[PDB]
Amino acid sequence: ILRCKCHHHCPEDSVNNICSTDGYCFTMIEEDDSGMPVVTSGCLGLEGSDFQCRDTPIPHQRRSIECCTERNECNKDLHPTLPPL
Amino acid sequence: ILRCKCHHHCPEDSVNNICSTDGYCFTMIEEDDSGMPVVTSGCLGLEGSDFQCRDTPIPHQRRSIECCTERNECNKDLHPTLPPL
Amino acid sequence: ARCSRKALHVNFKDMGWDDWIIAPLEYEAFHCEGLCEFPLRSHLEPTNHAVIQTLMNSMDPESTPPTCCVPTRLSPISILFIDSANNVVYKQYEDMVVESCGCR
Amino acid sequence: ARCSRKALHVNFKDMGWDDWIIAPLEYEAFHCEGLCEFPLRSHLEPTNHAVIQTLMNSMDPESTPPTCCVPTRLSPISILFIDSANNVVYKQYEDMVVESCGCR
């Protein structure tokens, strides 16, 4: 039972910008159509995490995600970077 | 394990216009936007059947459904009629 | 708006069923609705499959639509009603109320 | 087209994962897709809730969308892959392949 931060997108069965999970904390950076880095963070469950905790290149989108389990809120100290052109 | 007829809409894990179920055979009559009686038939499962085996008035649609379990293909001898204006 | 539980107020009288159903004539069923987007967060309890499909959709929206926001836990309600033999029956119906939503 | 199982061909190389995944690099995942319309037929194995929502949608499409065509049984596949410690691992992943579809 791991606690994680969220700021962009964070669930209403969980106040104070903290979510709990059996999986992983994540931080993601994304280029919104604007093209400003928009970073988000939260909890990923155990099932599916092998596939979510790595990057898959999507056309017309720049995105990178990282995961962690080392400590509560370990995702505060994840700093994913966008894939270069 | 009851067998039923279908002619309009009938599943491809079940050839020969016969479907098997633990619930009910049904026949339905429906007024397609054309306004010709379009009749269909098939199998309904047990769960949900209290709610499906009776009519609920829908606006701009004329529809009636009936169900049966008395014998294999009992739905051949169901003749639902459309709700009057 | 991300995939989540929203209200669905069911009125049986509105359905014309006040002729067999005695009580209750209304109840809160809830529905799921909302986007299922990468990454599929823990509360959405995705399958391996939903994750793969979500990835595939966003890299080729022709191959497959996105995954769907649907109920993943449900609870029952009992209904008091008249049956075809004219018995009054009090029956627990399963899977009547959305308790949680997720991407499948 | 009514709710049913359609093809989803997954190519891991296409996903860039050929750097950790050794085998297989492709597999058939299938997806569900299609209309969920009254009455919800037996093979679609609806819940009580899906039936109610289906009725409600068609009498008031504002209150709730129709129900969704989603997988209702899934099967696993094993994947041979390299982990972060550089071990080669052969692992069964659950819920990888759509075996049946239904309205939820």
Curated annotation (Swiss-Prot), chains A, B:
Source domain of life: Eukaryota
S-S bonds: C4-C25, C6-C10, C19-C43, C53-C67, C68-C74
Modified how: Autophosphorylated.
Extracellular membrane side: 1-85
Cellular compartments annotated: Cell membrane
Function: On ligand binding, forms a receptor complex consisting of two type II and two type I transmembrane serine/threonine kinases. Type II receptors phosphorylate and activate type I receptors which autophosphorylate, then bind and activate SMAD transcriptional regulators. Receptor for BMP7/OP-1. Receptor for GDF5. Positively regulates chondrocyte differentiation through GDF5 interaction.
Subunit structure: Interacts with high affinity with GDF5; positively regulates chondrocyte differentiation. Interacts with SCUBE3. Interacts with TSC22D1/TSC-22. Interacts with TGFBR3.
Family recorded in the similarity comment: Belongs to the protein kinase superfamily. TKL Ser/Thr protein kinase family. TGFB receptor subfamily.
Name of this chain's protein: Bone morphogenetic protein receptor type-1B
Record organism: Mus musculus (Mouse)
Included stretch of the parent chain: 29 to 113 of 502
Swiss-Prot record, chains C, D:
Recorded consequence of changing R2C: In BDA1C; less effective than wild-type in stimulating chondrogenesis; impairs BMP signaling through BMPR1A
UniProt tissue specificity: Predominantly expressed in long bones during embryonic development. Expressed in monocytes (at protein level).
Effect caused by changing N48T: In SYNS2; resistant to NOG inhibition; no change in binding with MPR1A and BMPR1B; strong induction of chondrogenesis
Localization: Secreted; Cell membrane
Cysteines engaged in disulfide bonds, as pairs: C3-C69, C32-C101, C36-C103
Disease involvement: Acromesomelic dysplasia 2A: A form of acromesomelic dysplasia, a skeletal disorder characterized by short stature, very short limbs and hand/foot malformations. The severity of limb abnormalities increases from proximal to distal with profoundly affected hands and feet showing brachydactyly and/or rudimentary fingers (knob-like fingers). AMD2A is an autosomal recessive form characterized by normal axial skeletons and missing or fused skeletal elements within the hands and feet. Acromesomelic dysplasia 2C: A form of acromesomelic dysplasia, a skeletal disorder characterized by short stature, very short limbs and hand/foot malformations. The severity of limb abnormalities increases from proximal to distal with profoundly affected hands and feet showing brachydactyly and/or rudimentary fingers (knob-like fingers). AMD2C is an autosomal recessive form characterized by skeletal abnormalities restricted to the limbs. The craniofacial skeleton and axial skeletal structures are normal.
Quaternary structure note: Homodimer; disulfide-linked. Interacts with serine proteases, HTRA1 and HTRA3. Following LPS binding, may form a complex with CXCR4, HSP90AA1 and HSPA8. Interacts with high affinity with NOG; inhibits chondrogenesis. Interacts with high affinity with BMPR1B and lower affinity with BMPR1A; positively regulates chondrocyte differentiation and induces SMAD dependent signaling. Interacts with FBN1 (via N-terminal domain) and FBN2. Interacts with TGFBR3.
Similarity comment: Belongs to the TGF-beta family.
Functional description taken from the UniProt entry: Growth factor involved in bone and cartilage formation. During cartilage development regulates differentiation of chondrogenic tissue through two pathways. Firstly, positively regulates differentiation of chondrogenic tissue through its binding of high affinity with BMPR1B and of less affinity with BMPR1A, leading to induction of SMAD1-SMAD5-SMAD8 complex phosphorylation and then SMAD protein signaling transduction. Secondly, negatively regulates chondrogenic differentiation through its interaction with NOG. Required to prevent excessive muscle loss upon denervation.
Name by which UniProt lists this protein: Growth/differentiation factor 5
